[PDB]
Swiss-Prot record:
This is Glutamate mutase sigma subunit. One of its GO terms (molecular function) is metal ion binding. Catalyzes the carbon skeleton rearrangement of L-glutamate to L-threo-3-methylaspartate ((2S,3S)-3-methylaspartate). InterPro entries: Cobalamin-bd, Cobalamin-bd_sf, GlmS.
Length: 137
């Protein structure tokens, strides 16, 4: 791929745009091609931003404690979508609140989601994450 496109969608319902109004702005500001898929959005649409742009990474934004409940195997759905190579981020209220890292990353990484941000994360982590991951910083 020519550039690194990140595609962030706020997944499932129970989402106004909280921590996804300036939390998107951060990434767009980070010099990334950042496609705002929209607050409340299906994964076949995030996939669609990866078809459109050529995503290197696909982010889900969880604001409802059910991040996993939809998201599980978007890496594999991206894989499945003929968009294999994409490494995924999953951030926010990834589990109900948030459980415990050893178990949680075992969950996410088993599906393929490489990196797990907590609920109420600085975007500096996510930016430093995509940089460090994608041969930057």
């Amino acid at each position: 791929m020519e550039k690194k496109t990140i595609v962030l969608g706020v997944i499932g319902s129970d989402c106004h745009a909280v921590g996804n109004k300036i939390l998107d702005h951060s990434f767009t500001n980070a010099g990334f091609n950042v496609v705002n898929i929209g607050v409340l959005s299906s994964q076949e649409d995030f996939i669609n931003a990866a078809i459109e742009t050529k995503a290197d990474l696909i982010c889900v934004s969880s604001l409802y404690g059910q991040g996993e409940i939809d998201c599980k195997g978007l890496r594999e759905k991206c894989d499945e979508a003929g968009l294999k190579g994409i490494k995924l981020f999953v951030g926010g209220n990834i589990v109900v609140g948030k459980q415990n890292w050893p178990d949680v990353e075992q969950r996410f990484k088993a599906m393929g989601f490489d990196r797990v941000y907590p609920p109420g994360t600085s975007p500096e982590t996510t930016i430093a994450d995509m940089k460090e991951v994608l041969g930057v910083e």
